[PDB]
Amino acid sequence: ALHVVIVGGGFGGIAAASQLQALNVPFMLVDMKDSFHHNVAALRASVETGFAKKTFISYSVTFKDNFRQGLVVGIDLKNQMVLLQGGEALPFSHLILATGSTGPFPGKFNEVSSQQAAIQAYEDMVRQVQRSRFIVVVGGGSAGVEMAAEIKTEYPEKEVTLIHSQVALADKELLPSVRQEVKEILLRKGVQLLLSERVSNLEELPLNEYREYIKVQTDKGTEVATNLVILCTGIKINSSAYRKAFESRLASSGALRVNEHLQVEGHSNVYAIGDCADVRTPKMAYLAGLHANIAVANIVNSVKQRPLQAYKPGALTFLLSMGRNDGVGQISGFYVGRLMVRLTKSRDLFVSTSWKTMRQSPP
Numbered sequence: 001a002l003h004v005v006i007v008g009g010g011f012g013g014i015a016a017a018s019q020l021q022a023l024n025v026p027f028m029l030v031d032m033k034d035s036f037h038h039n040v041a042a043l044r045a046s047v048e049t050g051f052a053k054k055t056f057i058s059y060s061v062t063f064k065d066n067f068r069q070g071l072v073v074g075i076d077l078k079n080q081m082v083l084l085q086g087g088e089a090l091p092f093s094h095l096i097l098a099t100g101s102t103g104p105f106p107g108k109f110n111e112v113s114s115q116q117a118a119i120q121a122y123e124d125m126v127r128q129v130q131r132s133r134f135i136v137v138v139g140g141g142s143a144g145v146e147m148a149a150e151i152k153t154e155y156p157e158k159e160v161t162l163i164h165s166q167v168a169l170a171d172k173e174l175l176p177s178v179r180q181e182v183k184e185i186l187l188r189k190g191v192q193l194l195l196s197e198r199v200s201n202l203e204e205l206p207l208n209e210y211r212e213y214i215k216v217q218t219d220k221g222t223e224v225a226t227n228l229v230i231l232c233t234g235i236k237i238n239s240s241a242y243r244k245a246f247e248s249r250l251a252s253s254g255a256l257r258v259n260e261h262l263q264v265e266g267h268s269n270v271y272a273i274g275d276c277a278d279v280r281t282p283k284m285a286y287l288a289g290l291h292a293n294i295a296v297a298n299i300v301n302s303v304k305q306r307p308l309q310a311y312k313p314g315a316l317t318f319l320l321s322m323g324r325n326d327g328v329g330q331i332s333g334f335y336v337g338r339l340m341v342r343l344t345k346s347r348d349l350f351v352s353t354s355w356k357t358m359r360q361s362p363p
């Protein structure tokens with residue numbers, strides 16, 4: 001009877017599939033790519049030659065028979081089936097939805113693709129950055145703040161402007177001390193900040209592509225002349241697998257309503273983990289891992305007739321790398337500075353934790 005299907009192999013889904021496989025529980029991991037994407041490092045991968053090969057990890061080397069590359073197009077709840085484009089139906093005793101989020105390319109790569117194509121996409125982007133003397137980053141959230149710092153750190157000679165629609169940078173959940181220091185670090189690197197300005201001609205702009213002249217405009221009348229436009233304008237919940245089947249149980253974002261055991265509302269053998277769960281914390285790979293531990297444990301506790309584990313958030317820990325040499329953040333809601341973030345995140349961007357989880361060695 002027992003068989004756990006995991007929709008999505010991001011941070012959540014490979015933590016779940018690793019755990020299930022190590023317990024020899026019957027399971028199937030489904031993802032549209034052939035490789036796990038360490039997207040935490042995607043921004044460095046768009047800046048450093050030869051780095052992208054280190055951010056994609058073949059699923060089938062790690063999971064073999066229990067991994068299927070396919071696009072989930074629906075879930076049949078009365079027959080307990082996951083429906084794949086091309087006609088495959090996977091039955092389940094327990095379902096884990098780990099579909100994460102979608103957004104503009106450099107920061108997210110969600111295509112039915114091979115590892116070699118994915119890698120080449122990032123290598124193309126490095127060549128775009130390298131060619132461009134003038135670069136605009138759109139969006140001053142936690143993503144675009146890292147984009148701008150990565151460019152200016154790897155190429156100080158380049159001119160980098162960041163345009164953000166708010167008065168302060170990065171997440172509104174962060175201690176004001178972290179958000180002020182993000183700004184100051186950006187300024188000390190030489191990044192041009194254009195705050196409280198929304199870019200207004202986005203739908204006409206060539207993206208991720210060097211041009212001799214691109215005119216960027218804002219809603220306050222500012223014009224910025226540039227060679228390259230990179231979008232860090234934010235993400236959307238990827239509800240493509242499940243929106244039809246779970247329509248009544250969705251948040252307004254598209255995320256799934258859960259209880260503290262991460263069971264989807266109305267169900268006992270369906271769980272949501274990571275960005276697609278309607279937990280009201282910022283979207284973090286770290287929390288994806290923690291939701292994977294709870295969901296896998298609760299499937300086992302659910303079948304073993306043991307009480308279930310609960311998720312109760314602690315104070316926000318959140319680190320911003322500011323190039324490979326700098327950064328700032330907070331640990332359990334307390335400020336931390338360059339030395340800590342530099343070695344914990346900035347140097348490696350957690351890449352080697354994904355290789356370890358996957359039992360592979362980086363190329």
Ligand SMILES: Cc1cc2c(nc3c(=O)[nH]c(=O)nc-3n2C[C@H](O)[C@H](O)[C@H](O)COP(=O)(O)OP(=O)(O)OC[C@H]2O[C@@H](n3cnc4c(N)ncnc43)[C@H](O)[C@@H]2O)c(O)c1C
Pocket residue numbers: 007008009010011012013030031032033037039040041042043070071072073098099100101107109110111142143146238240241273274275276283284285286287288319321345
């Ligand atoms: C952009 C960015 C993000 C960072 C960064 N840093 C951190 C960090 O330091 N710590 C952290 O915790 N999170 C960090 N994050 C956040 C992190 O990206 C996310 O919260 C993390 O990706 C969430 O993991 P999830 O598993 O929830 O979601 P993913 O999107 O990673 O994976 C979802 C997968 O489902 C897949 N999928 C497969 N088949 C599908 C189907 N048929 N239908 C729909 N989806 C499908 C997608 O293709 C995708 O691979 C960072 O430096 C940058 C620049």
Ligand SMILES: NC(=O)c1ccc[n+]([C@@H]2O[C@H](COP(=O)([O-])OP(=O)(O)OC[C@H]3O[C@@H](n4cnc5c(N)ncnc54)[C@H](OP(=O)(O)O)[C@@H]3O)[C@@H](O)[C@H]2O)c1
Pocket residue numbers: 138139140141142143144163164165166171197198199200202232233234235282283284318319320321
């Ligand atoms: N753990 C980490 O260090 C880390 C790193 C990166 C991302 N993340 C997480 O991933 C999630 C996404 O973060 P994100 O930075 O990608 O998105 P985000 O937090 O939504 O930030 C993107 C920002 O871009 C702005 N924006 C959108 N369109 C714009 C335009 N035309 N001109 C100017 N500004 C524009 C948005 O403002 P409006 O809404 O006003 O448009 C928003 O403030 C977050 O939950 C984040 O915490 C975490």
